[PDB]
Design an enzyme around this catalytic site. Structure first.
Site, PDB file in Angstrom:
ATOM      1  N   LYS A 208       0.793  -1.190   0.000  1.00 33.72           N
ATOM      2  CA  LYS A 208       0.000   0.000   0.000  1.00 33.72           C
ATOM      3  C   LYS A 208       0.865   1.298   0.000  1.00 33.72           C
ATOM      4  CE  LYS A 208      -4.535  -1.549   1.048  1.00 33.72           C
ATOM      5  NZ  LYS A 208      -4.437  -2.478   2.191  1.00 33.72           N
TER       6      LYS A 208
ATOM      7  N   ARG B 266      -3.060 -10.479   4.204  1.00 32.49           N
ATOM      8  CA  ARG B 266      -3.405 -10.480   2.832  1.00 32.49           C
ATOM      9  C   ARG B 266      -2.327  -9.869   2.030  1.00 32.49           C
ATOM     10  NH1 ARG B 266      -5.728  -6.905  -0.501  1.00 32.49           N
ATOM     11  NH2 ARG B 266      -7.214  -7.737  -2.125  1.00 32.49           N
TER      12      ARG B 266
HETATM   13  N1  LIG Z   1      -9.717  -7.527   3.826  1.00 36.39           N
HETATM   14  C1  LIG Z   1      -9.146  -6.630   2.997  1.00 36.39           C
HETATM   15  N2  LIG Z   1      -9.607  -6.549   1.730  1.00 36.39           N
HETATM   16  C2  LIG Z   1      -9.019  -5.640   0.923  1.00 36.39           C
HETATM   17  N3  LIG Z   1      -9.356  -5.395  -0.355  1.00 36.39           N
HETATM   18  C3  LIG Z   1      -8.464  -4.420  -0.615  1.00 36.39           C
HETATM   19  S1  LIG Z   1      -8.397  -3.649  -2.184  1.00 36.39           S
HETATM   20  N4  LIG Z   1      -7.599  -4.006   0.339  1.00 36.39           N
HETATM   21  C4  LIG Z   1      -7.963  -4.797   1.361  1.00 36.39           C
HETATM   22  C5  LIG Z   1      -7.507  -4.906   2.663  1.00 36.39           C
HETATM   23  O1  LIG Z   1      -6.487  -4.124   3.100  1.00 36.39           O
HETATM   24  N5  LIG Z   1      -8.113  -5.837   3.457  1.00 36.39           N
END
Ligand SMILES: Nc1nc2[nH]c(S)nc2c(=O)[nH]1
Ligand SMILES: Nc1nc2[nH]c(S)nc2c(=O)[nH]1
Lengths: 267, 267
Positions: free
Chosen positions: B213, B247
């Site tokens: 990010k 993730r």
């Molecule tokens: N759970 C989750 N889903 C996401 N989809 C995106 S794009 N960014 C994210 C995230 O940071 N966490």
């Protein structure tokens, strides 16, 4: 937090600003000499420059570990001279021998790095005092029957401190190192990792040296050149637990991880 | 520590054994269709297989974010079918739309992943309940005037929980996500990183999504493809602070960092 800086002759290392990165200089001795011939020393200088460009704050230079007495100097002394003149950064010297230490400093080295924590040759600490250089005291021992891993490390380190101080070393020239990968089972290494924060009660900056060590191998089941990720994890946890310094091989990558840690924990 | 496992139709995710790695599946839509043509779906399947071989425990598949309603399904549905049949791992589906969710599950998806935490389309949580799938509720909002970053995130997440529960979602199908990189200044991102442990008082497993990010960019001053180290630091600190899941994009590297963290913290 630290009310003082590390004083290193010409150089000044701030302990509050970032985790300081110490770059491990790998000494590749020429097979065909015992001294300071072009290839070993030029490779050394080369490597030191690369590490300086990748974010290193200190060049660590060690001659025997992985010897003679005479040989350690003849091989360590020409490298400190060159790296000194050609790279503008404090140098630590990686030895547990008083003579070696002495000569290294006279050759331009700034920090002493003793894997035996002054137990080796207590005289080292006198050298340390005499030149007024910071000295890194690492936890080590020649056995591994521990009553209690942590409580013993702290006792032992403290025994090193006593020796340092009784030689005239100022609190501010003292740094500690938990000695991960020395005198510990893979399990005891993980436990120490998991409790590194306990060294802080002693009141001294802490250096961590876990770069590519064997216990990372044990966990990941991965050879020495596949341990970047594993090293990185040990680095991160160390910064979170209070390390002022990390001694690594992969200087580009760890500086990035250190600087991201620093921002997050708010150092 | 967790007295229950994540139940995912055919698959069972243990929450005490390791930090679970969720692999971000990157959907590259064919320009020349709107549906599920060979190139998008075969690349998708390819990628999913690579991630499965690198240590991923869950494949996350999202169609619009970075749209239509009709289009989201037509493009997301063929991928869940193929990856489902060709890769033996639970799939989460990355949408905040109730219809989309529904169809995704009927197509084989196992977890819902809602970046709006049921605030989007509260109906989503009803779908969630109806199929009895775990639902990930992420912190988000359409502004960023915060009385108090942490206290507000916790309040907000809690507001998502209320919605989930009032639809019939069992505590055990609820996972939370602090939503780093959403609705927060770079500074607020670092603060949340620095206090992630506070989400644990809510009593629910936590997923962290910080992969490559923008705030990592801000700190390191480095573009999206140079953020492996920075991501790794966020991963490590997250595991130390109590994450059950991360993730990420770089599945090989983060599994190694996760597994080294797990060994050290003693998970
Ligand atoms: N759970 C989750 N889903 C996401 N989809 C995106 S794009 N960014 C994210 C995230 O940071 N966490
Ligand atoms: N301070 C310090 N010095 C070292 N020399 C070697 S080898 N390993 C280490 C280490 O882990 N720490």
């Amino acid at each position: 937090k630290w009310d003082y800086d590390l004083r290193c002759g010409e150089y000044t290392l701030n302990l509050n600003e970032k985790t300081l990165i110490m770059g491990i200089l790998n000494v590749t001795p020429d097979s065909f000499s015992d001294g300071g011939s072009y290839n070993e020393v030029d490779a050394a200088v080369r490597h030191a420059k690369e590490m300086r460009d990748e974010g290193a704050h200190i060049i660590d230079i060690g001659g025997e570990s992985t010897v003679s007495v005479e040989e350690e100097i003849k091989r360590v002394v020409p490298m400190i001279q060159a790296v000194s003149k050609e790279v503008k950064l404090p140098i630590s010297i990686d030895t547990y021998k008083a003579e070696v230490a002495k000569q290294a400093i006279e050759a331009g080295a700034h920090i002493i790095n003793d894997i035996w924590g002054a137990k080796a040759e207590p005289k080292i600490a006198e050298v340390a005092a005499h030149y007024d250089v910071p000295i890194i005291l690492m936890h080590n021992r020649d056995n591994m029957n521990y009553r209690n891993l942590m409580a013993d490390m702290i006792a032992d380190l403290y025994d090193s401190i006593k020796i340092a101080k009784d030689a005239g070393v100022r609190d501010e020239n003292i740094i500690l190192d938990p000695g991960i990968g020395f005198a510990k089972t893979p399990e005891q290494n993980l436990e120490a990792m998991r409790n590194l924060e306990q060294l802080n009660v002693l009141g001294y900056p802490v250096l961590l040296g876990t770069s590519r060590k064997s216990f990372i191998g044990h966990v990941l089941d991965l050879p020495v050149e596949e341990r970047l990720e594993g090293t990185g994890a040990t680095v991160c946890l160390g910064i979170e637990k209070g390390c002022e310094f990390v001694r690594v091989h992969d200087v580009k990558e760890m500086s990035r991880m250190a600087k991201m840690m620093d921002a997050m924990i708010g150092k």
